[PDB]
């Protein structure tokens, strides 16, 4: 069957910390609503 | 100038970088503690005459 992955499969891309910032990363992710 | 940091690093996280791609927080390899990083004080010098 099939089902909707709304906003699942999001992980921390790198070994670096960040705080109170918006970061953009190009990496293997699970597309939303797949 | 180092300083004790209340920052949380994940076990795999060793370096916390800045907007300019500069490390502004480190984890000491020997003791697993988080240290705050800050470049030493600087500024212009103006001579009033």
From Swiss-Prot, chain A:
- Full-length numbering of the shown residues: 27 to 60 of 1273
Q: What is this protein called?
A: Spike protein S1
**The protein's assembly and partners:** Binds to host ACE2. RBD also interacts with the N-linked glycan on 'Asn-90' of ACE2. Cleavage of S generates a polybasic C-terminal sequence on S1 that binds to host Neuropilin-1 (NRP1) and Neuropilin-2 (NRP2) receptors. Interacts with host integrin alpha-5/beta-1 (ITGA5:ITGB1) and with ACE2 in complex with integrin alpha-5/beta-1 (ITGA5:ITGB1). May interact via cytoplasmic c-terminus with M protein. May interact (via N-terminus) with host bilirubin and biliverdin, thereby preventing antibody binding to the SARS-CoV-2 spike NTD via an allosteric mechanism.
Briefly, what is this protein's role? Attaches the virion to the cell membrane by interacting with host receptor, initiating the infection. The major receptor is host ACE2. When S2/S2' has been cleaved, binding to the receptor triggers direct fusion at the cell membrane. When S2/S2' has not been cleaved, binding to the receptor results in internalization of the virus by endocytosis using host TFRC and GRM2 and leading to fusion of the virion membrane with the host endosomal membrane. Alternatively, may use NRP1/NRP2 and integrin as entry receptors.
């Amino acid at each position: 069957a099939y089902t909707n992955s709304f906003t699942r499969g999001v992980y921390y891309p790198d070994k670096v910390f960040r705080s109170s910032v918006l970061h953009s990363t190009q990496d293997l992710f699970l597309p939303f609503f797949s | 100038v180092l300083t004790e940091s209340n920052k949380k690093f994940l076990p795999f996280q060793q370096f916390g970088r800045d907007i300019a791609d500069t490390t502004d927080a480190v984890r000491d390899p020997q003791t697993l503690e988080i240290l705050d990083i800050t470049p030493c004080s600087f500024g212009g010098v103006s001579v009033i005459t």
